[PDB]
Amino acid sequence: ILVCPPLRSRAYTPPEDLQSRLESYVKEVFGSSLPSNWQDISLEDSRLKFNLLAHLADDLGHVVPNSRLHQMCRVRDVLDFYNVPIQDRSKFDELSASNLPPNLKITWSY
Amino acid sequence: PVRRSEKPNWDYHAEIQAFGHRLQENFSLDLLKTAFVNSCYIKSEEAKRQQLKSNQELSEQGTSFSQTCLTQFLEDEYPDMPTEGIKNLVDFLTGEEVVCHVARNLAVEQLTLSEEFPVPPAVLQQTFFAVIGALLQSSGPERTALFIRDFLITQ
Amino acid sequence: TARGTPSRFLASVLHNGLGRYVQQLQRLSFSVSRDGASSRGAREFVEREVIDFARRNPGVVIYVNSRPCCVPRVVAEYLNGAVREESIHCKSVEEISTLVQKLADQS
Amino acid sequence: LRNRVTDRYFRIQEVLKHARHFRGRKNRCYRLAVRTVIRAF
Amino acid sequence: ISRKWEKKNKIVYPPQLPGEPRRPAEIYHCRRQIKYSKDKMWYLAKLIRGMSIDQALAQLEFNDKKGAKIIKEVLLEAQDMAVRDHNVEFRSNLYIAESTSGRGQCLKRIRYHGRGRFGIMEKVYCHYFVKLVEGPPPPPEPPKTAVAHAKEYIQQLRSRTIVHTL
Amino acid sequence: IGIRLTLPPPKVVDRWNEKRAMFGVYDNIGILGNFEKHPKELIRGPIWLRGWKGNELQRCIRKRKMVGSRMFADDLHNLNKRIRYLYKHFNRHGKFR
Amino acid sequence: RQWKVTSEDLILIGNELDLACGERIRLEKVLLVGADNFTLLGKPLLGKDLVRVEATVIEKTESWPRIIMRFRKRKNFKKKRIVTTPQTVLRINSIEIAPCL
RNA sequence: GAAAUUGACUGGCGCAAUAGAUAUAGUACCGCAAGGGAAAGAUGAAAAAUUAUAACCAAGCAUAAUAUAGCAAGGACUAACCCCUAUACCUUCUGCAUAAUGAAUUAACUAGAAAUAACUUUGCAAGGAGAGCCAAAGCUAAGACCCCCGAAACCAGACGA
Numbered sequence A: 001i002l003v004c005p006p007l008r009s010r011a012y013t014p015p016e017d018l019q020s021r022l023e024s025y026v027k028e029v030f031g032s033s034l035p036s037n038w039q040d041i042s043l044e045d046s047r048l049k050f051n052l053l054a055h056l057a058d059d060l061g062h063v064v065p066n067s068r069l070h071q072m073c074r075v076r077d078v079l080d081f082y083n084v085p086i087q088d089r090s091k092f093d094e095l096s097a098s099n100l101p102p103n104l105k106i107t108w109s110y
Numbered sequence B: 001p002v003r004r005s006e007k008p009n010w011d012y013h014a015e016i017q018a019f020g021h022r023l024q025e026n027f028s029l030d031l032l033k034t035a036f037v038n039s040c041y042i043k044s045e046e047a048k049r050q051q052l053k054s055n056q057e058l059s060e061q062g063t064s065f066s067q068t069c070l071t072q073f074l075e076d077e078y079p080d081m082p083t084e085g086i087k088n089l090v091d092f093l094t095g096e097e098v099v100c101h102v103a104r105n106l107a108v109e110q111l112t113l114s115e116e117f118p119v120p121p122a123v124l125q126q127t128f129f130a131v132i133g134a135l136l137q138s139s140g141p142e143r144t145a146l147f148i149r150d151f152l153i154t155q
Numbered sequence C: 001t002a003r004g005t006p007s008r009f010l011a012s013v014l015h016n017g018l019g020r021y022v023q024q025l026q027r028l029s030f031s032v033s034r035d036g037a038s039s040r041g042a043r044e045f046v047e048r049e050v051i052d053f054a055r056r057n058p059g060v061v062i063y064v065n066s067r068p069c070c071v072p073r074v075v076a077e078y079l080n081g082a083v084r085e086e087s088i089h090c091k092s093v094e095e096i097s098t099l100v101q102k103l104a105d106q107s
Numbered sequence D: 001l002r003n004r005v006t007d008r009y010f011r012i013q014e015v016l017k018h019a020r021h022f023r024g025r026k027n028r029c030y031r032l033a034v035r036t037v038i039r040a041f
Numbered sequence E: 001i002s003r004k005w006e007k008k009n010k011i012v013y014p015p016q017l018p019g020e021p022r023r024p025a026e027i028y029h030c031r032r033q034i035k036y037s038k039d040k041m042w043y044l045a046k047l048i049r050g051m052s053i054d055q056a057l058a059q060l061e062f063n064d065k066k067g068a069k070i071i072k073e074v075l076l077e078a079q080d081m082a083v084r085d086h087n088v089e090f091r092s093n094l095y096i097a098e099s100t101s102g103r104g105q106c107l108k109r110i111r112y113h114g115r116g117r118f119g120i121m122e123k124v125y126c127h128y129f130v131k132l133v134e135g136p137p138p139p140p141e142p143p144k145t146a147v148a149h150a151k152e153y154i155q156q157l158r159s160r161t162i163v164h165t166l
Numbered sequence F: 001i002g003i004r005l006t007l008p009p010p011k012v013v014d015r016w017n018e019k020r021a022m023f024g025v026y027d028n029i030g031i032l033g034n035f036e037k038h039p040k041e042l043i044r045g046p047i048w049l050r051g052w053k054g055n056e057l058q059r060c061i062r063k064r065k066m067v068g069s070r071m072f073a074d075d076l077h078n079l080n081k082r083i084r085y086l087y088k089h090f091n092r093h094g095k096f097r
Numbered sequence G: 001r002q003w004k005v006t007s008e009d010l011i012l013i014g015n016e017l018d019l020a021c022g023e024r025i026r027l028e029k030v031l032l033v034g035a036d037n038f039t040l041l042g043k044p045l046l047g048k049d050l051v052r053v054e055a056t057v058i059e060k061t062e063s064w065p066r067i068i069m070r071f072r073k074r075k076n077f078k079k080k081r082i083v084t085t086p087q088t089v090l091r092i093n094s095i096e097i098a099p100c101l
Numbered sequence H: 001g002a003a004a005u006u007g008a009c010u011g012g013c014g015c016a017a018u019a020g021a022u023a024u025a026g027u028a029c030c031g032c033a034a035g036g037g038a039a040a041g042a043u044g045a046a047a048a049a050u051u052a053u054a055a056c057c058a059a060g061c062a063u064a065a066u067a068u069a070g071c072a073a074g075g076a077c078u079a080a081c082c083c084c085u086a087u088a089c090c091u092u093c094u095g096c097a098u099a100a101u102g103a104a105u106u107a108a109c110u111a112g113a114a115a116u117a118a119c120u121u122u123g124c125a126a127g128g129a130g131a132g133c134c135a136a137a138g139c140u141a142a143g144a145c146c147c148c149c150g151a152a153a154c155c156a157g158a159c160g161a
């Protein structure tokens, strides 16, 4: 009998040292000899792409979806995707967290 | 007939704020709530407890200001009426029928905390003049004079 | 037909507009459903347009009830004890905005 | 007998609610009523 | 079929406050499936509407109709149930508030005509309904007086307005 | 009055039966199974209506041609009469010629 | 249209007036102004310096539904339509005159 | 209207008491006979609970007859009428308020079926289609178009003096 871990949230705040951590990661995965434009190195090799994306996913808790994996052509793009924040909440909570005027009342009978 | 409080969609603080805003008056919130709380509602709710501030000061202030201010408007616009006629016009404007009609179509009854529904006309008149007293305490004599001018000379 | 329906004379609520204008709309109750394709337009209206309407009309209390229903509705309560129940079933967001504004300007 | 009409009551009653204040059988019998509501409009 | 007249008899009321009128007793009775026409029974009921109970019994006793005898029996048993179960004080202190006749369940028989022709006979049946109310019979409405006629004419003349103008 | 006085009893449907959960499976058996089979031989029904559409007269002709021999006497008589009527109607009546 | 208005009056305009409710506007094309003991007559319009009318948009509503039915007999001709005309209720507040004759 | 030749179980986008079998039944009833041929029933877990809260809904009536004047209304109006306007409907027709047709009214049932092409939208394309067929942009697939009732008659086999 295997226990199931509790359900993870999709809330992902982009960390402040995303630049320096991406530097660390690209350094162990693509080797010590960096091209000066580390921005613009290709991800055409699927093994190198798997290693980089899997390391980033296991660190940051955020995984690139299958509909964006083909888009993930450069670590430029990978930096863009991990820069983009995604947010998880019920939208009843979203409508409440939006600054409601005092004459508007929301009830959630669900 | 059942009161709008026991009718489903209701929120008392929102209704009080909308009352002040749709009357375009900067009411004090606690003063308005105490102007809507009546003594009979007080007595019914201790009785329910065995199984705070009333209208009276605000009602008396609003009533006295209504008499004085209405008499002032009437005898300034019509200098030739004698005192009996000015007094009778003032008693008509602060009478039961006119004040209850104004309170009902301004929805003082919906916000009135009382014992019986429909609200008895004496209770509704007292609640309306407590609202007048709250407006006098919150805004000032000229502003509540404009309020009285509108909502009674229009009658 | 005039002979088959009631009639009345032109009137205001309490001599409205003489001293000051009082908005006769008091309450708006929006029954909307989370999962209803009929309620999609009202869902968009609650998402985008109800905040600005509530800010523009501070004298009106707006309740929004998200509950499982097939026909989304709006109930407008007016100061003289009037109640108007209207179906916003399968209406776009601009049609709902036009209707809710029209209810606001009614007596 | 698939696909019978089930809201014939409501169609009859919208014509009859326009015909309600008439005199005779034309305020309640649908045939005579619908011949008169049209003329009224 | 429906028996709401009997259920009306079995309706009950809350207890009375000591400071309000006495709420006079109401007694509902009916007879069903009377071998008689509802129109003729209507003539008898319209005769005994609004009478006192004894006045109705006298009129039905000296009328010459089968419906009159049947209605007399129904009135007697309604009076008996009135002062036996509904706490009517005096058996003469009742009047007929409602008295009407309805259609009953009829039967279709053939009526042989000439040639090969035929008709359908209707073995007509009817119901009789009565309501007895405790108290003296209400006074008949007095006929309209010339003073009242002049008054209503003056009221129309004073209710006239200037139409289709400001 | 032609209308119910009470609500009809609720018509609950299981959207996840065997039949609904597995509707449509193997409908691409020809183009995903080296064309050894056909959907027209996936179809189960009457023996004269397996992979064939037709209008009414064609259906009646096909039924009489295929299962005419092993058919009941009055059913075959009604089928002969129906074919005769449908022939007359389709070849002799209508708006367009 | 020509409206004979006074102060504290109500009129019903049969179209929308692109104004918010409770909005104070000035009516200008004054054909006539008058009191007891005197009237002033424009030719055909009075001076805007001479007379002002003040009105207030107090209601923006719709009319009751109007039926348009067309019927021609023995020709199967039968047509129904429902219209709701927009309307605007104005309260005439004040009528002011200035000494300019 | 050919042929040679080719090769080929246990469910319901059914009905639910005017429907679905005519069927509760070939019974009742009708006819000498062959033969024709119906209608309908609805409580509850318990009726060894006959009770009383079930209604509300067609036509028809009752509660509750009527008041100068006129297709029965509409414009209206303080006001039901009084004032003003106004030649029922369908079919048929050159043309019908027609004193031409049909209809007492209510409920239910009761009348547009498809090819050849064309057009629109896809797929593939000098080829298209899961053989066969068509092809000087075509072929394949789908969509979309063709009613109901009624004679006097004619023939076959029975049943009847």
Ligand SMILES: [Mg+2]
Residues within 6 Å of the ligand: none
């Ligand atoms: Mg049957």
Ligand SMILES: [Mg+2]
Residues within 6 Å of the ligand: H022
């Ligand atoms: Mg049958």
Ligand SMILES: [Mg+2]
Residues within 6 Å of the ligand: none
């Ligand atoms: Mg009826």
Ligand SMILES: [Mg+2]
Residues within 6 Å of the ligand: none
């Ligand atoms: Mg006339």
Ligand SMILES: [Mg+2]
Residues within 6 Å of the ligand: none
């Ligand atoms: Mg002719």
Ligand SMILES: [Mg+2]
Residues within 6 Å of the ligand: none
């Ligand atoms: Mg003519």
Ligand SMILES: [Mg+2]
Residues within 6 Å of the ligand: none
């Ligand atoms: Mg005639």
Ligand SMILES: [Mg+2]
Residues within 6 Å of the ligand: H100
């Ligand atoms: Mg003739």
Ligand SMILES: [Mg+2]
Residues within 6 Å of the ligand: none
């Ligand atoms: Mg005729």
Ligand SMILES: [Mg+2]
Residues within 6 Å of the ligand: none
């Ligand atoms: Mg003819």
Ligand SMILES: [Mg+2]
Residues within 6 Å of the ligand: none
């Ligand atoms: Mg011949």
Ligand SMILES: [Mg+2]
Residues within 6 Å of the ligand: H161
């Ligand atoms: Mg012989």
